Write a protein that binds this ligand. Structure first.
Ligand SMILES: O=C(O)Cc1cccc([N+](=O)[O-])c1
Ligand SMILES: [Zn+2]
Length: 257
């Protein structure tokens, strides 16, 4: 099955998921000089005051911080979006070294990591129905750079020892994702896809301009996770990022001058 190795990594995904070579794949390089300011874009509305995290999961590709999405409790709206999108999970992508890890790039710059907050359009009722629609998901992407620690991330880091290997989960209640957000909500937006199989072309991407800072110690604990299951040969969970894909016939719009 798919992964991030030599034999099963991004460059192979198209064999099982031909949409890998589609017209609206993600991530992309954001060319800041050609992304045009769009005055018609709205401020993004991130309403996470009632978010109810439940659990953290090692799915063998990343770890997912999961939310109760059975009511409108943590929603993303505004920005480029029409309607209301409910938070279901967040996860990250990261590198073996601080010089790579992000999926999106900014003028070809790779950040150490990228956080993806995944939301589904309530007009489709559930996640599985939403991913079948071109406006089904809104993913908020946030770059991580290594410097100062992110206090709000530390709860996540400290639980990772308990989900070292694929298929492990742990209770993870009361975690507030507001602690993961940067000061500014300036963003770029474009139409794209999931960045893992099945690579469905269902996402409005909203990539924040301002990275968060995490410490070397924090990212080092991401890199102690394992792709393998308990008791199998250890292969560190690192470089679980898809590289930039062709922009094709897309425009990247900026919310800011
Ligand atoms: O389980 C999976 O890899 C598919 C999936 C599910 C939810 C979000 C995703 N994304 O690319 O942001 C991908
Ligand atoms: Zn992701």
């Amino acid at each position: 099955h798919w992964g991030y190795g030599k034999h099963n990594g991004p460059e192979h995904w198209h064999k099982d998921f031909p949409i890998a070579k589609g017209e609206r794949q993600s991530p992309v390089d954001i060319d800041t000089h050609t992304a045009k300011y769009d005055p018609s874009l709205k401020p993004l509305s991130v309403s996470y005051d009632q978010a109810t995290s439940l659990r953290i999961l090692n799915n063998g590709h990343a770890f997912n911080v999961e939310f109760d999405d059975s009511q409108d409790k943590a929603v993303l709206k505004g920005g480029p979006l029409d309607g209301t999108y409910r938070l279901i999970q967040f996860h990250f992508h990261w590198g073996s070294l601080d010089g790579q890890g992000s999926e999106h790039t900014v003028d070809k710059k790779k950040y150490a990591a990228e956080l993806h907050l995944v939301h589904w359009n309530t007009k489709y009722g559930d996640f599985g129905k939403a991913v079948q629609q071109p406006d089904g998901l809104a993913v908020l992407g946030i770059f991580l750079k290594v410097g100062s620690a992110k206090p709000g991330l530390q709860k996540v880091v400290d639980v990772l020892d308990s989900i070292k290997t694929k298929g492990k989960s742990a209770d993870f209640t009361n975690f507030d994702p507001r602690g993961l957000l940067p000061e500014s909500l300036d963003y770029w937006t474009y139409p794209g896809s999931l960045t893992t199989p099945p690579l469905l072309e269902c996402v409005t991407w909203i990539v924040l301009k301002e990275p968060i800072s995490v410490s070397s110690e924090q990212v080092l604990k991401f890199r102690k996770l394992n792709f393998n299951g308990e008791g199998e040969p250890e292969e560190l969970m690192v470089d679980n990022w898809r590289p930039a894909q062709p922009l094709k016939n897309r425009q990247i719009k900026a919310s800011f001058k």
